[PDB]
Write a protein that binds this ligand. Structure first.
Ligand SMILES: [Ca+2]
Ligand SMILES: [Ca+2]
Ligand SMILES: [Ca+2]
Ligand SMILES: [Ca+2]
Lengths: 90, 90
């Protein structure tokens, strides 16, 4: 596997490390999404310590309105983060 | 940096390794896109050896119709690849 291929599988690896914790094992609920951002995005995103912030993140990511973040929705989130880091370095 | 953070920056790293070769340094032209897929996606995508295949890939990725693949368009491509690998493992 190339670096890019490793990065692709890392995205799947990490999503499932969090989505697999509780309930639907293929989607992130609020607490799973919260721990993902807090543990895995600490250098890009501000630590989440408030419920209103958890709710707002979920609302923003949850395109289909089912209260959880699926893999497609997680990818859109990765894209918004990756693009912000990209433009940071212009 | 966490694994997920490393994967985010890998996506930016690799795009620029190819986009920086010729012309517009912030976009992938056909030959750059071709070498990216051929060198960096050899385990996920079939090697590209025909011009009609290069053209078709570019056409599919090039959402804004300017003949090149920018970072946003490259991200949509990463998402389609990552999701295919995700569903492969259901
Ligand atoms: Ca879950
Ligand atoms: Ca959802
Ligand atoms: Ca270029
Ligand atoms: Ca374009």
């Amino acid at each position: 596997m190339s670096e890019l291929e490793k990065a692709v599988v890392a995205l799947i690896d990490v999503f499932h490390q969090y989505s697999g914790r509780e309930g639907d094992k293929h989607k992130l609920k609020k607490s799973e999404l919260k721990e993902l951002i807090n543990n895995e995005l600490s250098h890009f995103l501000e630590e989440i310590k408030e419920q209103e912030v958890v709710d707002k993140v979920m609302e923003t990511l949850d395109s289909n309105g089912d209260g959880e973040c699926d893999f497609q929705e997680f990818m859109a989130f990765v894209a918004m983060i990756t693009t912000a880091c990209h433009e940071f370095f212009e």
